Amino acid sequence: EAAELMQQVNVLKLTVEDLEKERDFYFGKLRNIELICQENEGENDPVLQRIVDILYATDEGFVIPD
Amino acid sequence: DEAAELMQQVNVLKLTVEDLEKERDFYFGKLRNIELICQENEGDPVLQRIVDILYATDEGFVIP
């Protein structure tokens, strides 16, 4: 009844939190990479420049923050 | 009534799950591509810090 759908809600809500956690983990790795890159934009290495290209690439439903 | 509006919340949550997986895949993909560049240029303190970044582990995560 209610108890069955609420079971689904309960389970889904925790999935949402596991996914947020997982997304925050990956997104933080990129923010750290982007700090290391900004922090060596004086060295002019194209290898770090290859990495900045990747960082800033968009896809469907993803925009540059403004 | 209540079963109508819980089905509604279940549906909403299914979309949130999909959106988060989409968001997560996007970010994991960037990290693999970056890992890819790194595992071509083994042999410099910077790219090894980037690899140190990628490989850092937290509770709930295992290096595969």
Binding site: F27, E34, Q38, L55, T58, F62, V63, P65 | -
Partner: peptide, 11 residues
């Protein structure tokens, strides 16, 4: 300083 990493757009 501010991050330029693509984030999800609003709906």
């Amino acid at each position: 300083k501010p991050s330029k990493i693509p984030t999800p757009q609003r709906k």
